[PDB]
Amino acid sequence: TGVVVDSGDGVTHICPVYEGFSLPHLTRRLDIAGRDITRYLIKLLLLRGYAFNHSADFETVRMIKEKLCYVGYNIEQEQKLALETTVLVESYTLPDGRIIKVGGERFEAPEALFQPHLINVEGVGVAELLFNTIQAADIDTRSEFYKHIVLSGGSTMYPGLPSRLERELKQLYLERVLKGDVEKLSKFKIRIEDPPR
Amino acid sequence: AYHSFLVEPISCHAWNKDRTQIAICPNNHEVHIYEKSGNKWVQVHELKEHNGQVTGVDWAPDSNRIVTCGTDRNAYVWTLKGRTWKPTLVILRINRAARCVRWAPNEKKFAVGSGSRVISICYFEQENDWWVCKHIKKPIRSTVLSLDWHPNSVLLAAGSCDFKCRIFSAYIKEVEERPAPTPWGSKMPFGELMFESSSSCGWVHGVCFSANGSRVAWVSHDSTVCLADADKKMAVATLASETLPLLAVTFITESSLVAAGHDCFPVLFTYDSAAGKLSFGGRLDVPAGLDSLHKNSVSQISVLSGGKAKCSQFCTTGMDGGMSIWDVRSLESALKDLKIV
Amino acid sequence: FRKVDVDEYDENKFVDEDAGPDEGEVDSCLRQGNMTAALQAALKNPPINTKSQAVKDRAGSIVLKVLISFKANDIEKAVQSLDKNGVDLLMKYIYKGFESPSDNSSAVLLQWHEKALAAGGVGSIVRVLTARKTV
Amino acid sequence: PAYHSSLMDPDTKLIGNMALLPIRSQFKGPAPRETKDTDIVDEAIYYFKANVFFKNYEIKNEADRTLIYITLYISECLKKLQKCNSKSQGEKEMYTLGITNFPIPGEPGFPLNAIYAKPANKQEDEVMRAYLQQLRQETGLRLCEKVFDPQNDKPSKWWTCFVKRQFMNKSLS
Amino acid sequence: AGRLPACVVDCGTGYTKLGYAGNTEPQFIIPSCIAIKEVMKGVDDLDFFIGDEAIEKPTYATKWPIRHGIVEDWDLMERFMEQVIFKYLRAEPEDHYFLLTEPPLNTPENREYTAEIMFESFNVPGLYIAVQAVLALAASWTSRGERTLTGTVIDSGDGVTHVIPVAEGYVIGSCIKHIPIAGRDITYFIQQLLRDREVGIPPEQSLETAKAVKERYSYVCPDLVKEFNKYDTDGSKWIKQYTGINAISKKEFSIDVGYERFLGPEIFFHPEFANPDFTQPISEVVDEVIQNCPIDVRRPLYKNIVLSGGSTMFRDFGRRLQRDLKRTVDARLKLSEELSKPKPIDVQVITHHMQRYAVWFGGSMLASTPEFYQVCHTKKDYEEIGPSICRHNPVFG
Amino acid sequence: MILLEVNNRIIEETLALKFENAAAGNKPEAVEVTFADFDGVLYHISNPNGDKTKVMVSISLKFYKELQAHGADELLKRVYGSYLVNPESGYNVSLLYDLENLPASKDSIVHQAGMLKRNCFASVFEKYFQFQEEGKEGENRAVIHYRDDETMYVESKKDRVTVVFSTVFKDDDDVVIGKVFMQEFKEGRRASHTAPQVLFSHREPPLEDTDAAVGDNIGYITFVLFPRHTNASARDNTINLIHTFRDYLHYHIKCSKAYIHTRMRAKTSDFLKVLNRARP
Amino acid sequence: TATLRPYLSAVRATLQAALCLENFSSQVVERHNKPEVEVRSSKELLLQPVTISRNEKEKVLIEGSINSVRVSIAVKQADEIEKILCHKFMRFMMMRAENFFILRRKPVEGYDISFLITNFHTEQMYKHKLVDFVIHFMEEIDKEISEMKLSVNARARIVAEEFLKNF
Ligand SMILES: Nc1ncnc2c1ncn2[C@@H]1O[C@H](COP(=O)(O)OP(=O)(O)OP(=O)(O)O)[C@@H](O)[C@H]1O
Ligand SMILES: Nc1ncnc2c1ncn2[C@@H]1O[C@H](COP(=O)(O)OP(=O)(O)OP(=O)(O)O)[C@@H](O)[C@H]1O
């Protein structure tokens, strides 16, 4: 009886299920999924000097995304790595033999899931949306939901996604539930699923 | 005797019971099993299932089963069916990378250390037909780097990034039963902390139990080697090396340890039970731009034959992609001033 | 809401398990030519556990003072009169010296480093890096 | 691309898999009588200077093989014609060249053996052989007229220039 | 746009076109070469010449820094720029924004090397590295009434010919295609034809003569045999004469100019005449590229095939290309109605007067507009954000 | 190329082509060219009223009025004579060439057109060289703001003319590289004692009470010209050199940073070969 | 000198000790792997920062960790000209950090240049050879900064004579 965060290619959904069925009420939807990230990568890769046409290279960038993109944990941190070092740079070979290099865009592209305005979408970010979806739900069932969030979908495989959500939900809680009691944060039990299959 | 399987590191290795085949991880998500033909090495197998770099490999002697753990958080138990090894997924219930794994001597269970700051003890339930595990958590504060079982398949030694060498009880009652009293203690309920080193420096890169398990040794990043025997109130002997950190260690007799690491060559350490002191009678690899057989750090060492009680041959795989077989007696002939025990 | 480092309150974080020579004695030997005795005197009871950055430096200065009074050719002798644990503590002190260049001190410390390195080996340095409790 | 023959009819006979096309000539051979004012030898000479530069050529009719043959033969004539002085000398030079027994399809020496079928029996052989010699005769003759400027003893440099070039990088020598 | 016009430089394989924005023609078109001496002490680095002044120089060695549009020698390219600025343009680099061009598929790293030179060495206040195809399309607005930055650009210079599809100002990299035939190949082919027929041509002037013949007499014909026949018939109205001076003896040598007039450019449509490794007719290559592009942009492409470069100046070049490309398309759309009614395809090859320096011209025009100073990366941004900013250049116009 | 050239190549070549075709009796082409020169100079070559038989060459100097107070007009008239015409709107000096009335030898007028800029400057130098040659002391120093934020000061004395430049180095490091060159000019007379004496002064202006600009990026070069330099025989060459000094200095500072690069490219390349050598 | 060799020997030994790295998956982030010395999100995995100083100017800062080492060098800058020549040279290489793979795009505050050597580097490059490079690098930059300085001076002289001798 837990909440499922299923993000595939077309759209991302947050579905709370209780002891058997999904409650159409409370369920939400974010207009930012797999494809949106792929297209966002293309934009980032053009600003870097690579000639990617949105319609002719979509499939190509998608593979770049799937092989190289990941979710940053602490963006300010991920940013410093990209600007101060070269540990993030990876070489990718395109269908024509040309070899491009990808760095900061590896985490920047997926950051859209958390910051929609980046791809000019009005919203709050799958994370903050996951918080509001349960903080509205029954006050008895909450603790259980918070500890049964399972990730589903192709676009939920980004390395470090689970850890990001957990850091986000924790951040919201500390401000929108504990008001700022650092000492009570320890009681916030958050267990995000993410199974192999 | 040196052989280069590749130029990239060999993350870890494991040999079958007869020492006929060896399984290594060539810095991959894969495990390659090699076999000797005449005086050459022929790749006979490829185990492709992990989705991250394989960090630990162990081979149960008698059941001929292979266990592997990876950075993808998974753990697989490989069984041989005809001419192909089939993997069975084992859920460690961890959210960080698995760093090491070892079969218990009784082969009824295995332990996996991970970045989740816990040790997953796995055993199979012939009722629901699958593998389950129980966690040893307290007081592990960091990543578990290495593991080594006690001859009784219950006690377990673990080395971690919180600078501590520990021995816990991994007592599962549903596969074995009531461990006989040991010098380490009489009460061994699951997870019980039996011993913990006192040093507050250096990651414990490798740990090892002696043949009778009454002594345990470990090598830390602060270039020290240590030994503690339960027959002397768990008194610990410490030796500060003058060289680079050691990454792997094993007993070759009850009073002799052979280690290797960043210097790239194996060394010898002997223990004086009487004085409770450790000594260095090292350097077994006596004569790129180095004078050692291995060109990069040695990260694993295993007893090939003769057990840990009277080892005649041992193996070393390293970050140079090399595997080296050493003959304990040949080393004693070449170095007439060498001890052992 | 992201300006807060929740990790700082994570109960899986790490926490380490949380003094000084004797001037009168050290100065005694110093103003007596007994260099080798001055060294050992200063190398005794390092503030390895006191929180005060002050008492630590108080000790580092006294040690540094001795290393300076030393004459180029009198080092090896006083370096070889220490037990491996001493050479170790010396090496930790030499590096703390490197952090406060002054005159030719930073040049003499380089001579010591050379001596201590031959005596204690590169592992005496490794132990400077790995120390959690230090000078 | 290259230029192909348009003299192929549904009622055109074959010798091997070459087209036994009509030719306006006073030379003897199995060649049919000609009705139209232009034969297969006219095309070859008309298209020569252009065709000679092509390296690849697609065969569309058995007619193209006869075209190809004549084209390759012109290259042989020019090699000879180049080094002689006077239209007359050149006419004698061309009788001799057309009388020499060149390699026919099927024998080593003949290039393009993978494209030309060899005479199926001894009769075809005699005919094919007689036909090709016919063309060599009636080709080196006309060619002799085109090559020499009304200022005899002058093999037009507008023909001598194609001496080093080979149609389809092939040669009858 | 301030008092002084921006500097515009199109560095090509064979020729560098340079000048000031707003002008219709480059103020200088010079060979892309630098002659040097060969541990450098003193100022030996300054001892050099470029352009014509460097092609022969007795005691100096001629070097060509640009191979196929790409910069192979940055040390030399940088010095070349030293004289482009202070000797020819006589511009105080710190006072003018600069618009430099780049080969298609130039890497992002190269743009940085170029920017390092312009900001670290010459201290330019602003820089813009343009994509030649875009400038060419802009130059075509000159005509042949509705501006657009979507089209197929056929740039044929001296190195290699490029067929570059452009959608709304952005090159479709994954679909670019090359053709091993360019200006230098046509010259070289004409040289052979001349060696095979005309005596008296000075060996050490074989290419020079061919080049002059290529630029003063060549053209593209509609049909080979018919062209060949015309010459062999009315020879007096087609064969031309050319006379030159022997660099030695200074004696006048004259020759006849014939078939090469149309055979030279002909290799664009029948590559096999002079190349053993390439055979695709340029018309097909154009077809092939447009076919590989996004279906929905294919029509826009066929309707705007623009020409650019010295080697596209041959008379009727665009006519022959259009016709040939139409045949291939039309024939292809025939097998459909047959196999099965696809709306017809409108193929249009645009030729305009500015073609020869299409790239520089388009560049001069765009650098004359106010938007140019908005899209250039300023020196300040260069120092505060870093060379990375020069990897991307906002398309505009 | 060490010394910067005095003449403008666009002017000379543009005219050369036009005169050549006129001389061959060809139909004149329309010409329209805008281009610049050092020190914020702007030029324009056009066909007045679209009359292709006429070619006008105009030059715009934001500080022309200043040179005008020091004989520019009189000098330009002496040099260009009847080629000189009323200044085009937006410019200070205009030269007009009638393609239908040119001299037998065009080289002289073309050469002179090339030196339009130099001829505009020449004036303030001839004036004060004469002041000294006569003895006229105490005459007000000339002040030419040849650049928006740079200034030249000419002054004549009993036996020496002094030209002083107030130049600016936008780049903080160019100032440093600048001092190295100035240091060598300061010691120039060690290789030739007759040559002018050069002085330098960073941040602070020579003592020679004005709106003198002070700053970490401003230097003051000073050439002291002697009679052997200012007399009627050496006068013109001296001018060809001195009026280009400022641009000559910044040109070399910049060519130095370009040489440094070839070095940095070479060392960097070396290092990279070594690291790759470290690979198994 | 007299003090050069001692300094570099002391720096070489310290690098020998620090460049003892192994692959380390992240303890903080699922399926991540970052250079611990940069992120610093696990105190136990960071070693003690140390400094080797030749004098008051030239010094080296070595920051080791379980899987990476950051090495910062304070290059010798005798005067203004050496100071700007150094700055341009260091910037020139940092701009090319990707080709160096072991160079940091920016210096640690207080130093002129910085390296970031990871376990991945010591895996594909004999660590002893890397210890060699850092020392070879230190020696060769001081030299280059010396030739440039002489080159700049040598050319300033010719440029001044060239101009002055024409009057
Ligand atoms: N390893 C990966 N990392 C990130 N994204 C991935 C990965 N693999 C696939 N994707 C993306 O996941 C999306 C496809 O996932 P999936 O097939 O589950 O969605 P779907 O069910 O087909 O569509 P929907 O969920 O909207 O109904 C695509 O955007 C694909 O690029
Ligand atoms: N009128 C002309 N007809 C045919 N070719 C010409 C004509 N004028 C110049 N050319 C040729 O144009 C070529 C140079 O053209 P262009 O300057 O565009 O090439 P480029 O830009 O230097 O080379 P690239 O574009 O490959 O970098 C030379 O082969 C020159 O001979």
Ligand SMILES: [Mg+2]
């Ligand atoms: Mg070009």
